Design an enzyme around this catalytic site. Sequence first.
Site, short mmCIF file in Angstrom:
data_model
loop_
_atom_site.label_atom_id
_atom_site.label_comp_id
_atom_site.label_asym_id
_atom_site.label_seq_id
_atom_site.Cartn_x
_atom_site.Cartn_y
_atom_site.Cartn_z
N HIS A 35 0.86 -1.18 0.00
CA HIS A 35 0.00 0.00 0.00
C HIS A 35 0.90 1.23 0.00
O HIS A 35 2.10 1.13 0.28
CB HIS A 35 -0.97 -0.02 1.19
CG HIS A 35 -0.33 0.16 2.53
ND1 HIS A 35 0.31 1.32 2.91
CD2 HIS A 35 -0.27 -0.67 3.60
CE1 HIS A 35 0.73 1.20 4.16
NE2 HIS A 35 0.39 0.00 4.60
N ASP A 40 -5.01 4.63 10.04
CA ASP A 40 -5.24 3.99 11.34
C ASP A 40 -6.42 3.04 11.24
O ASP A 40 -7.27 3.17 10.37
CB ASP A 40 -5.56 5.03 12.42
CG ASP A 40 -4.47 6.07 12.59
OD1 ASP A 40 -3.29 5.72 12.40
OD2 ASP A 40 -4.80 7.22 12.94
N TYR A 68 -7.95 14.71 4.25
CA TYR A 68 -8.74 14.01 5.25
C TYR A 68 -9.92 14.81 5.79
O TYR A 68 -9.90 16.04 5.80
CB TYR A 68 -7.88 13.63 6.46
CG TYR A 68 -6.63 12.84 6.15
CD1 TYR A 68 -5.46 13.48 5.74
CD2 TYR A 68 -6.62 11.45 6.28
CE1 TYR A 68 -4.31 12.75 5.46
CE2 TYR A 68 -5.46 10.71 6.00
CZ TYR A 68 -4.31 11.37 5.59
OH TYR A 68 -3.17 10.65 5.32
N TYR A 171 0.45 13.70 10.63
CA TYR A 171 -0.40 12.99 11.57
C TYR A 171 -1.57 13.86 11.97
O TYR A 171 -1.41 14.84 12.70
CB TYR A 171 0.38 12.54 12.81
CG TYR A 171 1.29 11.37 12.50
CD1 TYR A 171 2.58 11.57 12.03
CD2 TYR A 171 0.82 10.06 12.60
CE1 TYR A 171 3.39 10.50 11.65
CE2 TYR A 171 1.61 8.98 12.22
CZ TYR A 171 2.90 9.21 11.75
OH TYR A 171 3.69 8.16 11.35
N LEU A 192 -12.22 9.64 11.23
CA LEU A 192 -11.15 10.01 10.31
C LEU A 192 -11.34 9.25 9.01
O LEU A 192 -11.48 8.03 9.00
CB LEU A 192 -9.77 9.70 10.90
CG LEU A 192 -8.56 10.10 10.05
CD1 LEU A 192 -8.60 11.60 9.76
CD2 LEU A 192 -7.27 9.73 10.78
#
Length: 304
Positions: A35, A40, A68, A171, A192
């Site tokens: 990937h 997460d 995101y 992050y 998320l």
Amino acid sequence: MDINGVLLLDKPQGMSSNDALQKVKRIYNANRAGHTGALDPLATGMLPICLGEATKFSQYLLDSDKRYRVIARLGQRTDTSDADGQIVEERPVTFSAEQLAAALDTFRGDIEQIPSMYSALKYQGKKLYEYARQGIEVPREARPITVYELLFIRHEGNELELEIHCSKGTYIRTIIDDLGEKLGCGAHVIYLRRLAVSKYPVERMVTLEHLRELVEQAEQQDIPAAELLDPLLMPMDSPASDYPVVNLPLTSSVYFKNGNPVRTSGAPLEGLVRVTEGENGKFIGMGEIDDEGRVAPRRLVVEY
RNA sequence: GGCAACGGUUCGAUCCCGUUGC
């Protein structure tokens, strides 16, 4: 005859990126698969899966931008910075609209961040999360990242929703944890989803469940699963779409594929380039302009 | 190909990618 291409998987919630990758690898009966950037377990969204020869060019996506959508729970801080961790602090939410607006602005543009101990960054041969689970903290240096866009979506009750477009290795959990501290109430990620990776069409993203339905359909219709699965893949060179393409006549590619740099008409003065053969414009790998201005082979697709 | 050390990627990639060694 292994399959070569990129599958834009919508990662199931609760599943690790490796586990999702392995299931896809099996569904496509691929020999090699990787990937281009983990999500997460709590997160969902675009997880590009490179199959076969496509894995050779995963670095271009690993280093690309991502977008995101995140929802943070205000007033509670967790050890992991998300809902799968344990609450370590709980405080009243008392910031003002002006304070929130100011805090959000500090995360726009070029910033620095010290990643959570719950991450796959390496420290002396081991992942940080390995130390974290053992109750061991280790020193981490701040890393530079860029937030190209941060959209305030809503602040309702103890929930804050934002949309963030950022550079590789950012992050979101840490932006949220850090934001919680700046706000004086603490915060952690409860939702998320990666909406996109680079410029990939979100409409080409497919859920794991859909893949399984197609496999089932193929058996039902007595046809090879590949007939329904292969069309879902993006070209094996798509990860390098950002780079200029250089075409070589077959009379030149034969030397190129033998490791020899070659001269060609249309060729940039420098940088990496995608290289194709003959009229059919077949992709044969990545090249790079050398000193002599020649196109030197760098990473080629296997021939056969 | 493979093995190893180290690093990457949004966390339970030995598995994908990068550097170096064999």
